[PDB]
Scaffold this active site. Sequence first.
Site, PDB file in Angstrom:
ATOM      1  N   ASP A  99      21.161 -75.363 114.806  1.00  0.00           N
ATOM      2  CA  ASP A  99      20.974 -76.268 115.925  1.00  0.00           C
ATOM      3  C   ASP A  99      20.159 -75.717 117.095  1.00  0.00           C
ATOM      4  O   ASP A  99      19.742 -76.498 117.946  1.00  0.00           O
ATOM      5  CB  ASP A  99      22.367 -76.711 116.473  1.00  0.00           C
ATOM      6  CG  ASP A  99      23.265 -75.548 116.850  1.00  0.00           C
ATOM      7  OD1 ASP A  99      22.941 -74.388 116.581  1.00  0.00           O
ATOM      8  OD2 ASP A  99      24.277 -75.763 117.493  1.00  0.00           O
ATOM      9  N   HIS A 100      19.886 -74.404 117.192  1.00  0.00           N
ATOM     10  CA  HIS A 100      19.260 -73.818 118.372  1.00  0.00           C
ATOM     11  C   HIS A 100      17.772 -73.621 118.307  1.00  0.00           C
ATOM     12  O   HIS A 100      17.163 -73.308 119.338  1.00  0.00           O
ATOM     13  CB  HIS A 100      19.863 -72.426 118.711  1.00  0.00           C
ATOM     14  CG  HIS A 100      21.204 -72.560 119.401  1.00  0.00           C
ATOM     15  ND1 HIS A 100      22.305 -73.106 118.901  1.00  0.00           N
ATOM     16  CD2 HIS A 100      21.503 -72.133 120.658  1.00  0.00           C
ATOM     17  CE1 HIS A 100      23.243 -73.063 119.787  1.00  0.00           C
ATOM     18  NE2 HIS A 100      22.765 -72.460 120.853  1.00  0.00           N
ATOM     19  N   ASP A 164      29.653 -68.518 120.257  1.00  0.00           N
ATOM     20  CA  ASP A 164      29.036 -69.405 121.217  1.00  0.00           C
ATOM     21  C   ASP A 164      30.079 -69.626 122.312  1.00  0.00           C
ATOM     22  O   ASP A 164      31.223 -69.961 122.018  1.00  0.00           O
ATOM     23  CB  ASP A 164      28.680 -70.762 120.576  1.00  0.00           C
ATOM     24  CG  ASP A 164      27.773 -71.531 121.508  1.00  0.00           C
ATOM     25  OD1 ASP A 164      26.557 -71.342 121.443  1.00  0.00           O
ATOM     26  OD2 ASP A 164      28.266 -72.293 122.366  1.00  0.00           O
ATOM     27  N   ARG A 446      24.899 -75.855 132.150  1.00  0.00           N
ATOM     28  CA  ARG A 446      24.432 -74.730 132.935  1.00  0.00           C
ATOM     29  C   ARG A 446      23.102 -75.143 133.504  1.00  0.00           C
ATOM     30  O   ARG A 446      22.429 -76.011 132.933  1.00  0.00           O
ATOM     31  CB  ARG A 446      24.226 -73.484 132.073  1.00  0.00           C
ATOM     32  CG  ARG A 446      25.542 -72.950 131.591  1.00  0.00           C
ATOM     33  CD  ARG A 446      25.313 -71.978 130.465  1.00  0.00           C
ATOM     34  NE  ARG A 446      26.623 -71.449 130.142  1.00  0.00           N
ATOM     35  CZ  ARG A 446      26.962 -70.999 128.947  1.00  0.00           C
ATOM     36  NH1 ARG A 446      26.020 -70.870 127.998  1.00  0.00           N
ATOM     37  NH2 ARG A 446      28.241 -70.655 128.769  1.00  0.00           N
ATOM     38  N   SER A 641      26.426 -67.381 128.708  1.00  0.00           N
ATOM     39  CA  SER A 641      26.291 -67.299 127.278  1.00  0.00           C
ATOM     40  C   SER A 641      26.897 -66.032 126.722  1.00  0.00           C
ATOM     41  O   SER A 641      26.673 -64.926 127.241  1.00  0.00           O
ATOM     42  CB  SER A 641      24.768 -67.381 126.985  1.00  0.00           C
ATOM     43  OG  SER A 641      24.345 -67.213 125.635  1.00  0.00           O
ATOM     44  N   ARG A 643      25.741 -64.482 124.024  1.00  0.00           N
ATOM     45  CA  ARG A 643      24.760 -63.708 123.260  1.00  0.00           C
ATOM     46  C   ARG A 643      24.940 -62.180 123.363  1.00  0.00           C
ATOM     47  O   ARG A 643      24.721 -61.542 124.400  1.00  0.00           O
ATOM     48  CB  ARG A 643      23.309 -64.131 123.717  1.00  0.00           C
ATOM     49  CG  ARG A 643      23.004 -63.963 125.240  1.00  0.00           C
ATOM     50  CD  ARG A 643      21.658 -64.498 125.684  1.00  0.00           C
ATOM     51  NE  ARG A 643      21.786 -65.936 125.750  1.00  0.00           N
ATOM     52  CZ  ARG A 643      21.095 -66.666 126.629  1.00  0.00           C
ATOM     53  NH1 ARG A 643      20.223 -66.104 127.468  1.00  0.00           N
ATOM     54  NH2 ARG A 643      21.302 -67.986 126.665  1.00  0.00           N
TER      55      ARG A 643
END
EC number: 4.2.1.3
Length: 753
Positions: A99-100, A164, A446, A641, A643
């Site tokens: 999806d990203h 996520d 965000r 995030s 990440r």
Amino acid sequence: RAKVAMSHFEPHEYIRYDLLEKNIDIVRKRLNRPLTLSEKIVYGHLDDPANQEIERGKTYLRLRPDRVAMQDATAQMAMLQFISSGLPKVAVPSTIHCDHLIEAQLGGEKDLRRAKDINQEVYNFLATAGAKYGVGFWRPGSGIIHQIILENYAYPGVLLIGTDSHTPNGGGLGGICIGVGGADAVDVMAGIPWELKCPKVIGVKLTGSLSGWTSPKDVILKVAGILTVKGGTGAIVEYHGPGVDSISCTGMATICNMGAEIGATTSVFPYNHRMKKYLSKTGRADIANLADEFKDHLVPDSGCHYDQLIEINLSELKPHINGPFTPDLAHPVAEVGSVAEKEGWPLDIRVGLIGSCTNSSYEDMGRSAAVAKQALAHGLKCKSQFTITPGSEQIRATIERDGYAQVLRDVGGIVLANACGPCIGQWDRKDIKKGEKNTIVTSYNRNFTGRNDANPETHAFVTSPEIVTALAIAGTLKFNPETDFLTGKDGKKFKLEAPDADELPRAEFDPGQDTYQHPPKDSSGQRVDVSPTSQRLQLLEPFDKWDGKDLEDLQILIKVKGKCTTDHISAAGPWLKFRGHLDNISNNLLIGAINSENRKANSVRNAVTQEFGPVPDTARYYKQHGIRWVVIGDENYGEGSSREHSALEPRFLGGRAIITKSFARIHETNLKKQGLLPLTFADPADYNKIHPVDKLTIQGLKDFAPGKPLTCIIKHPNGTQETILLNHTFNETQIEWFRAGSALNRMKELQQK
Ligand SMILES: O=C([O-])/C=C(/C(=O)[O-])[C@@H](O)C(=O)[O-]
Ligand code: SF4
């Protein structure tokens, strides 16, 4: 007990509420007090309920998650670490969601076809590794991860971890769903217990009922203004109260979702009849029936204690819009026009964007279409550009069928592929130049500097999808839909009616096209190929073990001033192309952080050459010359995030420690996982004692211990030294990650070789 499958795709994996009940009962005989709902689900998933020390905010709990979910911008590095472990198969139900990486440009089908060509290398890698290790794969186009999870995988009482920070979205279906870095997901897929610091519990009592223009998004935009982006750190937010039955199941998911912006570990709602309705409409009537039989365990105990209690009266709540550069700067929509004017924020809205995991449900598309049909009835169309992202393929197929998508196209909107798109900066935006001041309003979550379009001057405001639609029609922040008039084609002034729409399709959902790929759990004879000259994928080389010595005469790479999110530390947008390639993505390290020395982003003094230059280049020069470095940060460093690249990148380029006033949770855990030392000032005023020119010695690593502070000697250039103490939250498990060089190195040592 009952043999009810966890999802339609895993017919043999059964829900274990019997296990949950069993564990809740061991723990409550030990604690002899009422348990909150989040305590029942979290303590019910303890690896050792009889012996686990349970103190809120203090002990680390060893837990057993039910399933793991990954999205393709973090799954690549979680699977490269899994490939280093050498383990042959994942131990719990696991999925990858693509999806990203779908860039918004031409809209829908054309963008999806283009992303499949452009990202072929990466989608191939993830499909192949998913087939080899037994991970389910949702193909590009399937939907945003959290919408596929609510529709297929979340259920009351699940403990789900996802790579996520918006995995809390699953709290809308009564599960405890927690965001983690890729290395934490590797622990659970490997079968080793996952550790989580025992949360505090903030209760939010909802009273009254939502009316008119106020939507579920306004509840969490209000809570974020109240608690601030750091107010939920270390806690789970537990919504309760009479007002809860006024909110749809995707509405509850919207509120749990954006609890990520106050730093909460996750948020949850008690099992109730709106959840049951959603489960039955998504083909899971058997799970709702089982959850009815175990309902006592899926609601809080009577009289449980919340560490903080907040009460929100839904009936007095009015529409909100938050921003511009933090999601906790909250304004009522009625006042944003005047504050913008006063503050110099651009009043004209260039683009209105609805979507993201926070606000892409069927109900959100219905409520937006309800504003738009009124504009259309007066011959108006959007004055701002307007884009719409459906949350999943099933929502896209159903809103198309039920007529909402054509209404949204006829007012001037472009429907984008079922993907994050402009929310993580995957947007080929051409209407403004870089550095041009402009305002966009979104139904996202965000609004950090440069995150949507890489332009630090874009002022982005987050609100509900029906207010984005109303403001896109008016084209200005000086428009309150509740009180102001538009002028139709016909010359008459008209007012917008508060939207009303069905929470779920009256008919059944239309599933749309086939996008799930089940693993062969027969074959699995896939070789995963990563070309050695690939620019997008690179196998990991292990980091160095600790040498046994203290860290002396560390250079400060940068002392950061103010807000420093993981989007400042490791930007997304165009850099997503390198999320499977550690050396290439390390070229964005800290380029958005503000240096206290000159107030600039990406301009630091090289201590050796005395030239000011890019942070990545300077960290690589220090690594090349054996200079070990440190980052000094301010409050809530690593906000945002999940990440793990924000921790992998400083380790890779020679960083040793990050010393701040405080850390956001996921980033602090990702730092400890990669063998760095996240340390906080024992007195936060000591941040002001450290100048960019100082060298630092961290001492005491040889008898590093839980609860013992480390000493830091600040060596000033004039010869003055000062000693300060630095706290850490390491337990002995985590100290072993540090001594080994990383948690992955430690795991490989335990493999008896
Ligand atoms: O960068 C990532 O792939 C991680 C995300 C996260 O953990 O939230 C992303 O979805 C976001 O919204 O920044
Ligand atoms: S917050 Fe945005 S980028 Fe992260 S999962 Fe949701 S839609 Fe995707």
